[PDB]
């Protein structure tokens, strides 16, 4: 027969199954290029599996390999398209955990598309039977690839100019309770909070269009509350209108309405998806709007150290898509946050370049190729009694948000807003004069001193004095110093 005579007898291309590390997916003597995409994975092999074979399997199944030999490989420049595992090391103070470095060719990805990049890096590797657990810890995205993405629509610098606000963190609050209020009652809270001294207020992530309140009603009343407050104070004000919806057509309809009534900003949720997010960031740039991103759902895969994706990677992907704000943690609030890991997140979102810093979880040096900066947002069970800690851990480019910490004031919403602004102003002034505001004694005294000229602040300090959330963290570092 012709078929039998034309059978491949080459050692590498004869039919059958061979190890991934003998298929060309492991290369300890590999030289990395400045155009290559790189990834760091924390792998846990099944009892009996060789650490190097596991790394080679992850590299092959995330590039061009399958479980058995295929001759069709000879119709392509195979060596150029194969990903290569090049370094494997044990995780310190651990047995059965190893770190693995992998390099990918630039031509494997579609320009400007996050769905495509993720389809390769996280497509099916996490479900492989030969591994018991797996976690993507970091990535190095090259200058060449960064240039095919838009980056933030507004950016921190242009945004401060749009608000005429410079040299201090911005302030905000969420409307409470989460659900149940009508459009007219929603506008009343916005008017009150802004008038007391907040820069912005926001709808809860779960507020969209429901039987108790339809969206068009909420948008109209909110613009009346914003204009009233701005005319009474002489400042630019705003509220995050939520445009999250079930279909792309409905999203666009809500974005075009908010622009028509003159909103300076709008907000979206992470549950919408990468493709919907990319479309929204392109629209905001073409229509002069600020875009806020709520990270609903992130903790389903970013909480445990043994399996999933580390938040610092999500930070990079979202800065590439082009969002203007993103929730990043508080350290002292009611949600999870280790101080060393959080400092790493803030740096990834605000710096022009990153240098290796193991104790902070920074594994790769990386430049941002002049992409604009993304503003971090701190929210979740925090109060004016903790002002000294917030200034020391979060920095100056950040939005501090107080929901229960404002509406829960006994003397009204306007009183709550005033207590928060005064506390901040006094702390920054003291800092700029060279005081040790972080000391457990200096910090509180500074607030106490300011309180003797502001009744609202005195009331708040006495109310939430002994309030704290101390619990062991889940996601921690693997290095020290």
């Amino acid at each position: 027969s012709v078929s039998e005579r034309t059978r491949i007898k080459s050692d590498r291309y004869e039919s059958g199954v061979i190890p991934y590390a003998k298929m060309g997916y492991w290369d300890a003597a590999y030289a990395v290029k400045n155009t290559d995409v790189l990834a760091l994975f924390r792998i846990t092999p099944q009892p009996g599996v060789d650490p190097v074979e596991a790394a080679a399997a992850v590299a092959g199944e995330s590039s061009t390999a399958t479980w058995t030999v295929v001759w069709t490989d000879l119709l392509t420049a195979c060596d150029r398209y194969r990903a290569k595992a090049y370094r494997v090391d044990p995780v310190p103070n651990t047995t059965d955990q190893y770190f693995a470095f992998i390099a990918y060719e630039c031509d494997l990805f579609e320009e400007g598309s996050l769905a495509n990049l993720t389809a390769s890096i996280i497509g099916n590797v996490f479900g492989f039977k030969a591994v018991s657990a797996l976690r993507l810890e970091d990535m190095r995205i090259p200058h060449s690839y960064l240039k095919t993405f838009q980056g933030p629509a507004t950016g921190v610098i242009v945004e401060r100019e749009r608000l005429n606000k410079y040299g201090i963190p911005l302030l905000g609050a969420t409307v409470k309770p989460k659900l149940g209020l009508s459009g007219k009652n929603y506008g009343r809270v916005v008017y009150e909070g802004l008038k007391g001294g907040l820069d912005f207020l926001k709808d809860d992530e779960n507020i969209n269009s429901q039987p108790f309140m339809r969206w068009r009603e909420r948008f109209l009343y909110c613009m009346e509350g914003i204009n009233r407050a701005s005319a009474a104070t002489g400042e630019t004000k705003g509220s995050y209108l939520n445009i999250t919806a079930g279909t792309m057509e409905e999203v666009y309809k809500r974005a075009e309405y908010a622009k028509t009534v003159g909103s300076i900003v709008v907000m979206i949720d992470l549950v919408m998806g990468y493709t919907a997010i990319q479309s929204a960031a392109i629209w905001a740039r073409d229509n002069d709007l600020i875009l806020h991103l709520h990270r609903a759902g992130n903790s389903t895969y970013a909480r445990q150290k043994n399996h999933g994706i580390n938040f610092r990677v999500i930070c990079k992907w979202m800065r590439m898509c082009g969002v203007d704000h993103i929730h990043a943690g508080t350290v002292v609030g009611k949600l999870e946050g280790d101080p060393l890991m959080i400092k790493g997140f803030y740096d990834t979102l605000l710096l022009t370049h990153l240098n290796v810093n193991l104790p902070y979880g920074i594994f790769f040096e990386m430049t941002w190729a002049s992409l604009r900066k993304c503003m971090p947002v701190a929210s979740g069970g925090i109060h004016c009694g903790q002002m000294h800690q917030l200034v020391h851990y979060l920095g100056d480019d950040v939005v501090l948000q107080f929901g229960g910490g404002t509406i829960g004031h006994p003397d009204g919403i306007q009183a709550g807003a005033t207590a928060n602004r005064v506390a901040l102003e006094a702390m920054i002034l003291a800092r700029n004069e060279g005081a040790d505001y972080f000391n457990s004694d200096i910090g509180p005294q500074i607030l106490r001193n300011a309180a003797k000229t502001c009744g609202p602040l005195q009331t708040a300090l006495d109310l939430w004095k002994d309030i704290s959330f101390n619990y062991t963290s889940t996601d921690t570092s693997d290095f020290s110093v």
Partner: protein, 139 residues
């Protein structure tokens, strides 16, 4: 009404010693300082009037204090502000701004509401001082 533009407007008017300290903090960073004036406080009024060129390499707050003293006795009733600029790659913008002189009294603003399609309103913010007198004689 008290105009709440600036970073320290929820605190009492600052003393000269207080102002000097904030200036000393900006120069320790290497920032450039300048002084501006206006009698139109609309929140979208971006360009205030410049008082001379910015002080780029001055390394002593006394030089900044002197210039502010002159403007105070030279300019008409209105508002004065001090700004700090950072020309570092990645910023190239202002990084601080605070008010340092106010008029005896400020009446404030009111809203005008033009009705357009459906229930939509087009809003306009109006100043009492501006609508009443020309520049130079508003306060």
């Amino acid at each position: 009404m008290r105009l709440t533009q600036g970073c320290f407007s929820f605190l009492p008017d600052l003393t000269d010693q207080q102002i000097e300290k904030q200036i000393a903090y900006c120069i320790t960073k290497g920032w450039a300082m300048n002084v501006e004036w206006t009698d139109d406080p609309h929140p979208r009024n971006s360009y205030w009037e410049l008082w001379g060129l910015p002080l780029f390499d001055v390394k002593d707050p006394a030089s900044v204090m002197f210039e502010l003293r002159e403007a105070r006795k030279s300019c008409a009733a209105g508002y004065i502000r001090i700004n700090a600029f950072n020309a570092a790659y990645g910023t190239e913008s202002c990084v601080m701004s605070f008010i340092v002189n106010r008029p005896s009294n400020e009446p404030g603003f009111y809203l005008e509401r033009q009705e357009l399609e459906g229930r939509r309103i087009a809003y306009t913010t109006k100043s009492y001082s501006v609508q009443a007198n020309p520049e130079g004689g508003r306060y």
